Design an enzyme around this catalytic site. Structure first.
Site, PDB file in Angstrom:
ATOM      1  N   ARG A  15      32.769  -2.261  80.336  1.00 19.94           N
ATOM      2  CA  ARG A  15      31.677  -2.776  79.523  1.00 19.94           C
ATOM      3  C   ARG A  15      30.430  -2.878  80.384  1.00 19.94           C
ATOM      4  O   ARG A  15      29.423  -3.442  79.963  1.00 19.94           O
ATOM      5  CB  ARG A  15      32.039  -4.140  78.940  1.00 19.94           C
ATOM      6  CG  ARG A  15      33.477  -4.244  78.397  1.00 19.94           C
ATOM      7  CD  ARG A  15      33.701  -3.440  77.121  1.00 19.94           C
ATOM      8  NE  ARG A  15      34.627  -4.094  76.181  1.00 19.94           N
ATOM      9  CZ  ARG A  15      35.961  -4.025  76.243  1.00 19.94           C
ATOM     10  NH1 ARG A  15      36.565  -3.339  77.211  1.00 19.94           N
ATOM     11  NH2 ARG A  15      36.698  -4.653  75.339  1.00 19.94           N
ATOM     12  N   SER A  16      30.503  -2.342  81.600  1.00 19.51           N
ATOM     13  CA  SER A  16      29.323  -2.258  82.455  1.00 19.51           C
ATOM     14  C   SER A  16      28.116  -1.560  81.809  1.00 19.51           C
ATOM     15  O   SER A  16      27.006  -2.086  81.894  1.00 19.51           O
ATOM     16  CB  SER A  16      29.647  -1.617  83.807  1.00 19.51           C
ATOM     17  OG  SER A  16      30.146  -2.579  84.703  1.00 19.51           O
ATOM     18  N   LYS A  65      37.009   0.163  95.602  1.00 18.48           N
ATOM     19  CA  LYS A  65      36.137  -0.777  96.311  1.00 18.48           C
ATOM     20  C   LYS A  65      36.274  -0.743  97.843  1.00 18.48           C
ATOM     21  O   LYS A  65      35.327  -1.069  98.571  1.00 18.48           O
ATOM     22  CB  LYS A  65      36.323  -2.209  95.779  1.00 18.48           C
ATOM     23  CG  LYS A  65      36.035  -2.339  94.282  1.00 18.48           C
ATOM     24  CD  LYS A  65      35.960  -3.819  93.861  1.00 18.48           C
ATOM     25  CE  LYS A  65      35.648  -3.937  92.383  1.00 18.48           C
ATOM     26  NZ  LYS A  65      35.874  -5.326  91.848  1.00 18.48           N
ATOM     27  N   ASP A 101      31.071  -9.353  93.236  1.00 18.26           N
ATOM     28  CA  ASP A 101      32.158 -10.069  92.569  1.00 18.26           C
ATOM     29  C   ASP A 101      32.122 -11.529  92.997  1.00 18.26           C
ATOM     30  O   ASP A 101      32.587 -12.408  92.267  1.00 18.26           O
ATOM     31  CB  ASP A 101      33.541  -9.461  92.889  1.00 18.26           C
ATOM     32  CG  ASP A 101      33.789  -8.142  92.181  1.00 18.26           C
ATOM     33  OD1 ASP A 101      33.410  -8.005  90.986  1.00 18.26           O
ATOM     34  OD2 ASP A 101      34.358  -7.225  92.820  1.00 18.26           O
ATOM     35  N   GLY A 123      42.811  -7.657  94.888  1.00 14.12           N
ATOM     36  CA  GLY A 123      41.826  -7.493  93.827  1.00 14.12           C
ATOM     37  C   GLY A 123      40.558  -8.292  94.100  1.00 14.12           C
ATOM     38  O   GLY A 123      39.917  -8.129  95.142  1.00 14.12           O
TER      39      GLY A 123
HETATM   40  O1  LIG Z   1      32.816  -2.097  84.809  1.00 15.74           O
HETATM   41  C1  LIG Z   1      33.676  -2.915  85.233  1.00 15.74           C
HETATM   42  O2  LIG Z   1      34.725  -3.167  84.575  1.00 15.74           O
HETATM   43  C2  LIG Z   1      33.455  -3.599  86.563  1.00 15.74           C
HETATM   44  C3  LIG Z   1      32.122  -3.317  87.309  1.00 15.74           C
HETATM   45  C4  LIG Z   1      32.370  -3.696  88.797  1.00 15.74           C
HETATM   46  O3  LIG Z   1      31.100  -3.702  89.368  1.00 15.74           O
HETATM   47  C5  LIG Z   1      33.010  -5.049  88.866  1.00 15.74           C
HETATM   48  O4  LIG Z   1      33.110  -5.405  90.250  1.00 15.74           O
HETATM   49  C6  LIG Z   1      34.397  -5.116  88.283  1.00 15.74           C
HETATM   50  O5  LIG Z   1      35.318  -4.492  89.155  1.00 15.74           O
HETATM   51  C7  LIG Z   1      34.416  -4.388  87.040  1.00 15.74           C
END
Ligand SMILES: O=C(O)C1=C[C@@H](O)[C@H](O)[C@H](O)C1
Length: 264
Positions: A15-16, A65, A101, A123
């Site tokens: 949902r980014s 990551k 995060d 995680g």
């Molecule tokens: O689009 C996502 O689901 C995320 C964006 C990362 O930047 C965040 O750190 C997380 O891992 C999830």
């Protein structure tokens, strides 16, 4: 016009884009794009290295990551502190890794008290420890199946100045530990946390990193008991703020992004 996006695998349900594009729109960057890119750890340097000039940065989710941190030639202190990076930002001669995060946990909780419990050893658990510290948490109990990883966790807690300890999942200390804690941050699968929901239910505040599907059994348990419940969407919202600022050079439009989140 600039380009950003999110790298990970799987990536379809991220949902980014909804968050970032709402921010860019609010900022008047109507011509910027943000794309979901299927990308494992080994492919991260392929993708990021292939980015043309107009890429300002990328978000990185599981499983890349650790690769993101190593790929970058500059790393923030906090990215080093937690040992991974969810954010790559283009610089004059390369890439800078950061880990937002941490903001994800500290911002989602808004305020923390003294005692916390962290479920999981990997995680976003290291970010959760640092974010909890940021909020003035004096004491942390790590409940995790991997005693070795959890050892590294307590060390980090110890290093950021938090009294931090380990407790095995079925050692029989969970009731004790839940009793002393104000805040629970769970970073483990919902399927795994589910079987302990009954014991964890009495925690006053839950931050569950999971957001889909929702509610997790744990979230339902805590909710039924009247605990404050925060989902991983709130975490996603708050980690995205610092990514937007680093990608755009402008303050995160928090209201616009909060509205976009309500739509989720
Ligand atoms: O689009 C996502 O689901 C995320 C964006 C990362 O930047 C965040 O750190 C997380 O891992 C999830």
């Amino acid at each position: 016009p600039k380009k950003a996006g999110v790298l990970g695998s799987p990536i379809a349900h991220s949902r980014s884009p909804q968050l970032h594009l709402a921010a860019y729109r609010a900022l008047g960057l109507h011509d910027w794009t943000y794309e979901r890119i299927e990308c494992g750890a080994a492919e991260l340097p392929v993708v990021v290295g292939g980015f043309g000039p107009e890429w300002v940065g990328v978000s990185v989710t599981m499983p890349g990551k650790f690769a993101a941190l190593r790929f970058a030639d500059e790393r923030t202190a906090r990215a080093d502190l937690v040992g991974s990076a969810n954010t790559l930002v283009r610089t004059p001669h390369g890439w800078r890794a950061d880990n937002t995060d941490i903001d994800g946990v500290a911002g989602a909780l808004g305020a923390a008290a003294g005692h916390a419990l962290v479920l999981g050893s990997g995680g976003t658990a290291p970010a959760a420890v640092v974010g909890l510290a940021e909020l003035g948490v004096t004491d942390i109990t790590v409940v995790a199946r991997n005693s070795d990883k959890a050892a590294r966790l307590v060390d980090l807690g110890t290093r950021v100045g938090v009294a931090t300890r380990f407790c095995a999942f079925d050692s029989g200390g969970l009731a004790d530990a839940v009793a002393a804690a104000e805040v629970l941050v769970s970073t483990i699968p919902a399927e795994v946390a589910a079987g302990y929901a009954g014991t964890l239910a009495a925690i006053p505040v839950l931050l569950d990193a999971i957001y889909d599907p929702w509610p997790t059994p744990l979230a339902a348990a805590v909710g039924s008991a009247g605990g404050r419940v925060i989902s991983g969407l709130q975490m996603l919202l708050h980690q995205a703020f610092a990514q937007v600022e680093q990608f755009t050079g402008l303050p995160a439009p928090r209201e616009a992004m909060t509205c976009a989140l309500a739509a989720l």
